[PDB]
Ligand binder design. Structure first.
Ligand code: FAD
Ligand code: FAD
Lengths: 482, 482
């Protein structure tokens, strides 16, 4: 008597992983509970990630297109920018959503427990109750509840990676800060050339900042095919002053007149630079080491992930882990899927994460979208492939939409001739890789995709045309192998 | 000695059908010739259809979105409209394209013969040479060439259906006129509620006209699922004064102060109406009866089509027919596919148009996209189906893009559980039905599509979510069958 509660399944985290696992299990007739330390469900993705970033990226995109339409004799002056209202529009999509999740938990009879959860023992969660209403600003009530579970689905996600030498200062922000829209900096450093920051960067440049980007690696969007990035970098090169790649941020020293940062590398200003703001988008660390997993017997990697098996099970059989905490690629769509397999095992169904492919998407302008085998992956595994690329320069619709600089690339298993990879650089790329997606899942071949009558004039049909080019049958391009 | 020429294959028409058939055959090592009465290839689709309509529809769409972004505190005044430059922008995508086709024929060594072709006998085309440079304005030189062929691919397309009682007047236009952009009428009647006119209508309303639409049928976009149209009609109802459906246009009498037209029906103004212009978008007639097909022994329906077999062959074995002349749905993507099968038969490969599904797309706002089985088709065949609908109201991305009024609908064979239909109302609908496309072509099931990890947040993933709803597994919506 005090604070103890018993459940079938207890999902630690109410992110994309967690509330999907939770509502699934729930859906199975299981008595489930979500332990979320903030009061809104949806996790990072709904609250300080996927959705506000993309709502913002969509406004920015429309203001860049009006810049273009002039030339078609459609004329507008610069827009009046209200960030109080911009800001609130984002907060609006988000709360609309968070409000619905909530409602959905109620309806599913799932219990949301607001509190940081920590493992007591293999069948007990110690919940240190928490109070607050704003995602990321919740505080411990001092009160504590003991929750017991048949099963537990750990879904505690990851967190922004902090660089050790970067000092604190209101002007050094991570992406939750950037998503704050406190103001458009006149000059913004972006540490890290990965998708998140280039996505942040794009909204700020279009709202007015001039950006610099620092990437320790050889390039931007590490992990996508350089041919694709090439197209992206060509079209946005004008948004940056300096695309400092293969360069080290060494000094970061805040001054009364902005943050002064020194870089080490090549094509790196030897003169320390000044910015009105610096966006640290250096990566994300998983939270396995912060839940006292050792008290449930759950094993955690030194890096912080909880390796798990195709069933989402951890070394502790009644304890499953899903989402970013489990491993890369840290993406909400990955997490929802692992989310359903672990909920099903919990309901005693035998489920394997069996999907062979997970999509990555930079929702920049243009969007860089890819799946399955990539040339580099292939080149790494020295897998033998057949890539079929269709240039948008040949596409009536891209020419009409003024995006003929992009293309669709389909890669095939050179032995089987089966599709195993897909890359799309161009507007809606992410709305279109889902078919090279299902394609790969159905084990289709170039004749499979190619004989599919895709509609014209569209961007979508370059998947088909890339297939005919595979088949050497495209009559919209010069003859192949004469 | 005069004008005679011998070829393997002679494609009558340089439309989407024809130049695809022509470049394919060509691609097979065959000696081919395109007989096109205008000087630009691409046919109606490139020149007075698909492409200019869609280039126009894309400018209009961006000006309607800027109307929306105000509310996000992004503020613009009405745009300055230059139709001389608008006009020329369209002409620019188009000639860019037509210029390339040309170049492609040269490179493929295909001969373009500019002249109206008429059958002499089963192996001879009489070509009455023609002169002009503007699509649709070509004139007969009086000179004539006799072309002989192993094979002939008839690809002569269709033409705007003229209503008998409509008088002539610069103010009564068909879609080539509307595509002229001679001026935004203050008031525009639209005879026919089909895709072409509603597409024409949308650009004009957004450029400023107030529209009225007359449809003899029970609705708009006849042939799509009413649930889909419903969504489209709800969102554009404000562009029309009168959506006169189930109504007859009886009088059409031009006056000094505009075209006065009387309608017969219900909710039809008993007072004859005045418009500054009337768009006759009543349908399209195929041209089989206008090529002296009877001289090749080719049989033509009284309606004007050339029925053909899965090999594109007509009753005359060495004579094939493709595209709109062959049958509905008259769509450029259909024609390119039939186009490749007839070219392959010509090269002695045995080819069947074997695709089981052809996409229809109104590129309006929102776009209405569908494939395969539709509820009405099903209801007609009394096929027994399973539809899975996913509301965009539940989609983070649609909410963020402000299109949560649309949805994705997947229909399944109730016996086999196989997908056989797909409908998508919403922006990019046509860029997304290609996966419910390949889906249907691969004979996928709801578990097939559903376990496909589509990326989030996107519009694309509602195909997947519609699948889980089929599976009763969607955790983004209230539980299914509790
Ligand atoms: C700016 C940004 C934009 C992104 N955009 C996208 C995108 O467009 N598409 C995409 O696929 N992904 C993108 N990502 C990825 C990210 O949204 C998803 O990978 C992530 O949400 C996956 O869900 P998750 O379940 O594993 O965990 P989470 O998002 O991380 O949720 C974990 C939750 O559990 C709670 N929690 C953590 N520890 C405890 C504890 N001890 N006790 C109680 N509660 C706890 C936290 O409060 C948090 O709410 C984005 C990320 C960022 C940072
Ligand atoms: C405004 C409009 C917009 C459209 N938009 C699209 C769209 O977005 N997507 C889509 O799929 N379809 C849409 N359509 C459909 C239409 O473009 C295609 O169905 C049509 O181009 C298909 O190609 P076709 O080969 O059979 O013939 P065609 O377009 O009709 O070409 C026939 C050609 O052959 C020539 N010809 C005809 N008779 C003779 C003769 N006797 N001698 C010599 N030459 C001759 C004509 O000059 C013409 O160039 C649109 C149509 C219109 C009218």
């Amino acid at each position: 008597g005090s604070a103890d509660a018993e459940y079938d399944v207890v999902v630690l985290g109410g992110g994309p992983g967690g509330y999907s696992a939770a509502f699934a299990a729930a859906d199975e007739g299981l008595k489930v509970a979500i332990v979320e330390r903030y009061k809104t469900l949806g996790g990072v993705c709904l609250n300080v990630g996927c959705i506000p970033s993309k709502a913002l990226l969509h406004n920015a995109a429309v203001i860049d297109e009006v810049r273009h339409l002039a030339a078609n004799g459609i004329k507008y002056p610069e827009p009046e920018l209200d960030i109080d209202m911009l800001r609130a529009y984002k907060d609006g999509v988000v709360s609309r959503l968070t409000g619905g999740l909530a409602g959905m938990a109620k309806s599913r009879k799932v219990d949301v427990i607001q509190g940081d959860g920590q493992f007591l023992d293999p069948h007990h969660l110690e919940v240190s109750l928490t109070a607050g209403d704003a995602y990321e600003q919740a505080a411990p009530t001092g009160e504590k509840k003991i929750v017991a579970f048949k099963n537990c689905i750990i879904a505690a996600g990851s967190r922004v990676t902090k660089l050790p030498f970067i000092p604190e200062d209101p002007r050094i922000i991570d992406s939750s800060g950037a998503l704050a829209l406190k103001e458009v900096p006149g000059k913004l450093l972006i540490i890290g050339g990965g998708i998140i920051g280039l996505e942040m960067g794009t909204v700020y440049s279009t709202l007015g900042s001039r950006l610099d980007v620092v990437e320790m690696m050889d390039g931007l969007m590490q992990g996508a095919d350089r041919d694709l990035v090439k197209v992206w970098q060509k079209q946005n090169e004008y948004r940056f002053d300096n695309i400092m790649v293969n360069t080290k941020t060494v000094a970061v020293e805040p001054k009364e007149d902005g943050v002064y940062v020194t870089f080490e590398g090549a094509n790196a200003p030897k003169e320390p630079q000044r910015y009105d703001a610096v966006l640290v988008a250096a990566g994300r660390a998983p939270n396995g080491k912060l839940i006292s997993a050792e008290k449930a017997g759950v094993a955690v990697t030194d890096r912080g992930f909880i390796e798990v098996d195709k069933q989402m099970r951890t070394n502790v059989p009644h304890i499953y882990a899903i989402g970013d905490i489990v491993g890369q690629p840290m993406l909400a769509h990955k997490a929802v899927h692992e989310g359903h397999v672990a909920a099903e095992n919990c309901a005693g169904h035998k489920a394997y994460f069996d999907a062979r492919v997970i999509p990555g998407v930079a929702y920049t302008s243009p969007e860089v979208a890819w799946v399955g085998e990539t040339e580099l992956s292939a080149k790494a595994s020295a897998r033998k492939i057949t890539k079929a690329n269709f240039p948008w320069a040949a596409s009536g619709r891209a020419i009409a939409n003024g995006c003929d600089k992009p293309f669709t690339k389909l890669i095939f298993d050179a032995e089987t001739g089966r599709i195993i990879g897909g890359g799309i650089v161009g507007p809606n790329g992410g709305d279109m890789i889902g078919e090279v997606y299902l394609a790969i899942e159905m084990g289709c071949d170039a004749a499979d995709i190619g004989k599919t009558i895709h509609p014209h004039p569209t961007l979508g049909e370059s998947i088909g045309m890339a297939a005919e080019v595979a088949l050497g049958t495209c009559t919209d391009l010069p003859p192949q192998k004469k």
